[PDB]
Amino acid sequence: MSIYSDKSIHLSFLRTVPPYSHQALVWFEMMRLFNWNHVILIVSDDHEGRA
Amino acid sequence: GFTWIVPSLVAGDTDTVPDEFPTGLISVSYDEWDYDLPARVRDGIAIIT
Amino acid sequence: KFGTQERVNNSNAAAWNGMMGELLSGQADMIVAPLTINNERAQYIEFSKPF
Amino acid sequence: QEAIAQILDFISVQTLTPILGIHGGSSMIMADKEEASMFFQFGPSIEQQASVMLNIMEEYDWYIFSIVTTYFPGYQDFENKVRSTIENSFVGWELEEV
Amino acid sequence: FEASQDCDLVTTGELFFRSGFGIGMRKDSPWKQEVSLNILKSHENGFMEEL
Amino acid sequence: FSEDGYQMHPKLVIILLNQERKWERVGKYKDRSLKMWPVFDLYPNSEEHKDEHLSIVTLEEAPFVIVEDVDPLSGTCMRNTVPCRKQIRPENRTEEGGNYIKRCCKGFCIDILKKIAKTVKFTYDLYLVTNGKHGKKINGVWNGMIGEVVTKRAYMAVGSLTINEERSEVVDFSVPFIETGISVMVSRSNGTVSPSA
């Protein structure tokens, strides 16, 4: 869950693996592969999407 | 000639102030009158009603 | 309208006024009119050399 | 103590009964309330405070300013709220550094 | 005055850098103030003007 | 409240650190408006004279000193106009409650003061005269801005004010900034013909 990433609300929280938000790095990494800078993003409206 | 301005958090309690803070430090804080059970509750109850 | 930003009608607003905003929305892909080239607009769109 | 209000937010989540507070920790600024949770505290919003800082600066007409911040919570938005508040106005005040 | 004197020569344009004429004296002259009053009177009575 | 759950319009106070350990509220915030109180005379490091207090009084005359009414909606003087206040007291009314006026003075005279003030670097308060207009000696007593200069209610008086021996006698005057004086304004009716070609 992404909502734990804000240190402000949960300041003691650490996790073994990266959130869904950090998954975009892969998507970003994915972008390297297609050699396309233009894409479209569809997100739900929540703390996780905006993050 | 340089001046500093602060949000609520740094001021904290009115009574305690390390003088490490420079003088002329400008900051915002909640009203003394407001900070009384008297009205915060009076108000809160009014809100409830 | 040709297009001017409006600062404070309710929330702060963009240079979406008249014809220019339409372009910002992506509805219009090109403006072909007697559109004056100026600093204000050049900050957001691309002007050709003056006709 | 700041933490007591957060516990109470959890309680709101737990029992769905309205709770509010008039002083002290319950009053302190807290994480944006989860929509499901119901809760009232007498704490000024970060954005509001930033606005007051701007009004104060405007009153003394101190146009030129910088922001020193830390990684402490709400720092990124503080910049965002200021950007909007500073940006909207016609005046040419200057942000020097963040 | 010279422009009047010859008329072979002419003055042109608009007077720039306007200035008042006042006696020059060493500082602290206890009379300059009186002088100022006196020349003031010269203007007041039309003497300065008459001359 | 607001979506975060904090009160939408909580009461708040502007506070400063007074000398030593004291927290003194410089001002208070009510609703939309920001209340600023100059609790400390000097925001400077302990100097008191600062810019010498220079309450200045003037009067409206066109073009030089122009009074304009500020936008009601667009609160407070806009851009160039500098505030000038005279307690708006009905002189005839006995009570004569005087609330300083909110009309903004602007023009050549104001602009000159603004330019000179920066070099001078002295801060000043500007208001409008009520009694006597341009200084006048009636019977044994003076009137106008000169009165406030004599009463020490004004240090310096600015305006379209002309110069004369009496006033130079009572108060020191600056050097003149514009060529002026008494003059005539008339209609020119016709031109003369002489057959001299």
Report how far residue B8's alpha carbon sits from residue F146's, in angstroms, rounded to the nearest whole number. Answer: 49
Q: Which positions in chain D have a beta carbon within 8 angstroms of at least one beta carbon in chain A? A: 6, 30-31, 71-74
Q: How many CB atoms lie within 10 A of CB D57?
A: 18
- Give phi and psi for E24, each to the nearest 5: -100, 130
Q: How many Cα atoms occupy the beta-carbon half-sphere of C50 within 13 Å?
A: 3
CB contact under 8 A, D42 and F1: no
| Measured distance between the N- and C-terminal CA atoms of chain D, rounded to whole angstroms | 29
Mutate to test the interface with B, among F8, F17, F24, F43 (most CBs of B within 10 A): F17
> With DSSP H G I counted as helix, E B as strand and the rest as coil, what are the percentages for chain E, rounded to 5?
45, 0, 55
User: Given an 8 Å threshold on Cβ–Cβ distance, is C12 in contact with D90?
Assistant: no
SS3 D65: strand
D-chain residues near F10 (CB < 8 A): 42-44, 48
**Tokens representing residue F41 in the block:** 């005379």
Per the CB < 8 A criterion, the answer to whether F12 and B30 are in contact is yes
Answer yes or no: are the C-beta atoms of E20 and F176 closer than 8 Å.
yes
| Cross-chain residue pair D58–F5, CB shorter than 8 Å | no
Tokens of D72: 């402490």
* Type of residue at D78: F
Rounded alpha-carbon distances, angstroms, from residue F83 to E11, F57, F91, F103, F122:
44, 11, 22, 7, 16
Strands B5-6 and B26-30: parallel
E13 CB-contact burial (10 Å; exposed 0-12 / middle 13-18 / buried 19+): exposed
B and E touch per CB criterion (3+ pairs under 8 A): no
Q: Do B11 and F15 touch (CB under 8 A)?
A: yes
Give the residues across from B5 on adjacent strands. Answer: B26
Residues from chain B contacting residue D29 (CB–CB below 8 Å): 8-9
Pairing mode of beta strands D20-21, D40-41: parallel
Residues of chain D contacting C10 with CB distance shorter than 8 Å: none
What gap in Å lies between CA F128 and CA F137, rounded to an integer?
20
- Separation between Cα atoms, residue D57 and residue D68, nearest integer Å: 16
In whole angstroms, what is the distance from residue B48 CA to residue F7 CA? 14
Q: Which residue has the tokens 């209609």?
A: F187
Check CB contact of D32 with chain F, cutoff 8 Å: yes
> Is residue D21 within 8 angstroms of chain F, CB to CB?
no
Name the residue in chain A with its Cα closest to that of D2.
Answer: A9
Round to whole Å and give the CA distance between A34 and B3.
Answer: 52
Binary contact (D40, F34; C-beta < 8 A): no
- Taking the alpha carbons at both ends of chain E, their separation in whole angstroms is 14
Structural determination approach = cryo-EM
Angle (CA) B38-B39-B44 rounded to 5° is: 115
Do F and D have ≥3 inter-chain CB pairs under 8 A? Answer: yes
Residue D34 CB-density burial (10 A; 0-12 exposed, 13-18 middle, 19+ buried): middle
Alpha-carbon distances of D21 from B47, D25, D31, D91, rounded to whole Å: 12, 8, 15, 39
CA of F8 vs chain D CAs: smallest distance (Å):
9
Distance CA C22, CA C20 (A): 5
Closest C-alpha to F173, from F135, F133, F121, F141: F135
Give the span between the Cα atoms of F99 and F131, in whole angstroms: 16
Is residue B32 helix, strand or coil?
coil
CB F12 within 8 A of CB B31: yes
Residue type at A47? H
Interchain contact C8–D (C-beta under 8 A): yes
C-alpha dihedral, F177 to F179 to F184 to F189, nearest 10°: -130
Task: Measure in Å the smallest separation between the Cα of D70 and chain F Cα atoms.
Answer: 22
> Which of left, alpha, beta for C12 (phi over 0: left; psi -120 to 50: alpha)?
beta
Does F167 carry a binding-site annotation? yes
Tokens representing residue F176 in the block: 């003149």
Q: Do chains F and E touch (3 or more CB pairs under 8 A)?
A: yes
Q: Are the beta carbons of C8 and D87 separated by less than 8 Å? A: no
